[PDB]
Amino acid sequence: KTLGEVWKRELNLLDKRQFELYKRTDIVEVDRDTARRHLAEGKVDTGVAVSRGTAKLRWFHERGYVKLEGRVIDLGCGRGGWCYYAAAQKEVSGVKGFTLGRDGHEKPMNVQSLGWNIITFKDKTDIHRLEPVKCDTLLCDIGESSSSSVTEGERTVRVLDTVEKWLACGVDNFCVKVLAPYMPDVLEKLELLQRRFGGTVIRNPLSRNSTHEMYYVSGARSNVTFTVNQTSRLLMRRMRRPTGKVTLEADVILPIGTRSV
Numbered sequence: 654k655t656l657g658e659v660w661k662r663e664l665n666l667l668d669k670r671q672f673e674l675y676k677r678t679d680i681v682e683v684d685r686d687t688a689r690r691h692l693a694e695g696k697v698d699t700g701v702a703v704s705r706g707t708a709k710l711r712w713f714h715e716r717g718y719v720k721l722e723g724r725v726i727d728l729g730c731g732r733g734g735w736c737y738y739a740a741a742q743k744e745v746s747g748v749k750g751f752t753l754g755r756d757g758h759e760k761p762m763n764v765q766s767l768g769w770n771i772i773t774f775k776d777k778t779d780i781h782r783l784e785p786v787k788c789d790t791l792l793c794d795i796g797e798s799s800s801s802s803v804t805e806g807e808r809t810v811r812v813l814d815t816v817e818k819w820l821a822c823g824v825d826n827f828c829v830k831v832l833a834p835y836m837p838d839v840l841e842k843l844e845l846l847q848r849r850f851g852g853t854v855i856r857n858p859l860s861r862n863s864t865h866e867m868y869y870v871s872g873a874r875s876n877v878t879f880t881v882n883q884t885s886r887l888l889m890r891r892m893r894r895p896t897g898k899v900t901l902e903a904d905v906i907l908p909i910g911t912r913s914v
């Protein structure tokens with residue numbers, strides 16, 4: 654009965670065209686033209702991002718929502734957009750990325766943007782059964798959308814449940830995707846996590862309107878119920894005023910090469 658649950662129900666009632674228009678209404682997105690061309694040509698030394706995820710993490714990082722320091726672990730790294738972004742930061746000493754990379758799941762992409770040499774990619778890995786390892790910065794960008802709010806809730810609670818095992822090891826920084834923060838059980842788990850590890854949930858402006866995803870981050874503290882409902886209100890307002898109006902921003906270009914010595 655949360656506003657977010659109402660949003661989800663109304664989202665599914667939209668006809669095909671209503672939905673397409675709604676999804677990009679007033680959203681911000683990076684121009685991926687150059688990156689796509691470079692990757693298609695096999696270029697590995699131009700600094701382009703392997704996915705839209707790089708710009709997503711940059712947004713949190715550049716405004717202090719998450720500090721990227723020391724030993725970084727990236728659960729559900731996919732192509733590696735977050736791993737490459739983290740590897741290029743002076744404060745980061747090493748990056749370990751884990752992902753399924755099988756049966757349709759994206760495999761890590763190998764490019765040589767700054768610090769590629771300090772990244773250790775590991776595919777064929779289900780992070781829910783991966784024994785926690787000590788790190789300083791914990792990242793996780795997992796959460797598969799579902800037309801069912803109940804299913805999105807189940808998937809979100811499972812991610813938070815697994816991530817809590819890792820946070821329990823003692824981590825200074827974190828940025829974790831929360832697919833369905835609007836679900837009651839999820840809100841409560843977040844409130845419990847906040848009392849245990851601090852942080853709060855923040856909506857990334859690069860997220861599309863078809864998902865209510867928000868990220869649990871260590872760099873801010875605020876009432877989770879309030880902020881999640883603020884996002885529900887914004888998503889609902891956009892559905893009542895469809896325009897498809899998008900604002901393009903420059904994609905991230907990282908320096909290149911190894912970090913040595």
Ligand SMILES: Nc1nc2c(ncn2[C@@H]2O[C@H](COP(=O)(O)OP(=O)(O)OP(=O)(O)O)[C@@H](O)[C@H]2O)c(=O)[nH]1
Nearest residue numbers: 664665666667668669672798799800801861863864
């Ligand atoms: N009414 C309606 N809802 C849809 C349609 N397609 C998807 N949705 C809804 O939109 C939600 C968002 O899913 P998507 O954006 O399509 O996929 P995603 O994996 O979350 O992200 P993308 O990979 O960028 O598409 C889904 O969970 C559905 O509830 C459609 O054709 N009509």
Ligand SMILES: Nc1ncnc2c1ncn2[C@@H]1O[C@H](CSCC[C@H](N)C(=O)O)[C@@H](O)[C@H]1O
Nearest residue numbers: 704706729731734735752753758779780794
């Ligand atoms: N249980 C699991 N274990 C490991 N990886 C998983 C997983 N469930 C989903 N994934 C992977 O998590 C990834 C989420 S998309 C991550 C994008 C990444 N942040 C970037 O910037 O490129 C997908 O590749 C998905 O295959």
